[PDB]
Write an enzyme that holds these catalytic residues in place. Sequence first.
Site, mmCIF file in Angstrom:
data_model
loop_
_atom_site.group_PDB
_atom_site.id
_atom_site.type_symbol
_atom_site.label_atom_id
_atom_site.label_comp_id
_atom_site.label_asym_id
_atom_site.label_seq_id
_atom_site.Cartn_x
_atom_site.Cartn_y
_atom_site.Cartn_z
ATOM 1 N N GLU A 295 1.373 -0.378 -5.205
ATOM 2 C CA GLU A 295 0.118 0.370 -5.231
ATOM 3 C C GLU A 295 0.550 1.796 -5.554
ATOM 4 O OE1 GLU A 295 -1.178 2.997 -2.541
ATOM 5 O OE2 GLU A 295 -2.054 3.369 -4.514
ATOM 6 N N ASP B 232 -11.245 0.109 -1.928
ATOM 7 C CA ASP B 232 -11.570 1.458 -1.442
ATOM 8 C C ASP B 232 -12.584 2.188 -2.336
ATOM 9 O OD1 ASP B 232 -9.819 1.642 0.920
ATOM 10 O OD2 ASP B 232 -8.169 1.634 -0.523
ATOM 11 N N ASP C 118 0.821 -1.202 0.000
ATOM 12 C CA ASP C 118 0.000 0.000 0.000
ATOM 13 C C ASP C 118 0.867 1.269 0.000
ATOM 14 O OD1 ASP C 118 -1.764 1.497 2.827
ATOM 15 O OD2 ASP C 118 -1.620 2.162 0.733
#
EC number: 2.4.1.25
Length: 500
Positions: A340, A395, A293
Amino acid sequence: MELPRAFGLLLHPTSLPGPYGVGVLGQEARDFLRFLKEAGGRYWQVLPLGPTGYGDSPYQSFSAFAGNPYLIDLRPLAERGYVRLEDPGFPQGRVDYGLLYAWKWPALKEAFRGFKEKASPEEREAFAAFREREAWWLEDYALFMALKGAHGGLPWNRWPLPLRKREEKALREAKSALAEEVAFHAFTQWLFFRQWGALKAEAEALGIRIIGDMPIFVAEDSAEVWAHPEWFHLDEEGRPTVVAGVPPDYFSETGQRWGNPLYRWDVLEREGFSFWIRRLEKALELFHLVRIDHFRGFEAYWEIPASCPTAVEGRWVKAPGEKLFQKIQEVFGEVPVLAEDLGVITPEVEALRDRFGLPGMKVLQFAFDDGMENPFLPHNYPAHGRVVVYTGTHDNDTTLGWYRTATPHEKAFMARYLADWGITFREEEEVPWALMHLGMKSVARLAVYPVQDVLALGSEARMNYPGRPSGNWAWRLLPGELSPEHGARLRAMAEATERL
Ligand SMILES: [Cl-]
Ligand SMILES: [Hg+2]
């Protein structure tokens, strides 16, 4: 890394259908892998698998190494008579973390009593062997959780000084005084990794590789920060002097303040980045590929004064990404990481990413809000195709939900672009499938789709809504909801795009 031209599905284990309030690592998980294989999929992506706290978020764990006890299948234990299971009335198609908390922990404790009473010497030795093996992180984790029940759930940096500063004495006495509670937590860890290990074997037997996920920053109140305060920017009281986040954008004039503690990279560099080498070592034991992430944070990160409620008063600080990954490559001789790289990223970030052959990400939901130069549109994907395309991430809203709230311009342009690629559709429920097809026609080596889009579910099935105070990480499949027909559709689409 050389990725084969294929496709996969995104599904956190908690979303699996089944009795007792939450998806677990059991029969249904195996059934899902079988479904995936039947559909011709070769990848299964999940979110972080550690223990959660307030918010139930897999990205703010009490530990960067432990497994989530809520994922433990209790049925195998019930079969051995270690515990009796009841349904207090868990909801349908969603996790109620409150009821789960109130019911699963006591059940797990009950199962442990059953174990200490009926377990065979073999199992007892396997358990003991497990503890000696994971000692490097399990001793701190288990004691950490045990000390929480001794101090009203308080964060570690609010415990009495002797414990907070980990004085050798206090720790010796604590483990002894809480020995049975400490064993309890290691017990939950033993069952987790055991069941995940079996599941991983099942995936591999089916030709499926698992894509894991790990947040670049760890949580403030976690066992590893408590045991290694020297690696983070804390004050003598154990409080973060600065926290993670992102600077103000055209959207958030206040930027974002995540609150995560920040690493003292200089200190980590001198120690050969041991903490990170450990994070990767564990990840490689659970997954075949691991996505990190906010990857840009390896090249530079936004430092925010811990006292401030916003991010407006931050500053960019460079991090030694290059040295870190050179180390990772040394130890593991490969960097099986997916970056990411969403949002604002610089040429420096790109250089770091491509330097180690790390695959980037592409999200179709963000490809029609502009013109043809949008990097998320397939024709702009890099020639080498070393990227993973998604319709939407965990998300984002489901693709159907996104479409219902999309601007007329995005909807019209999306329709024309698809048509340009030979894709056509008639009703809104078909938009998720139209976009999945577009991604499969692209040059991207991997196309991974959330199960919500395969089902064409609306906003009600959104996994996480950044900003929304509750209702996140709760969606669940209903028994039989993912039908063989759904599998055959995916298979035919993969078959028509050279992804089988
Ligand atoms: Cl996230
Ligand atoms: Hg995030």
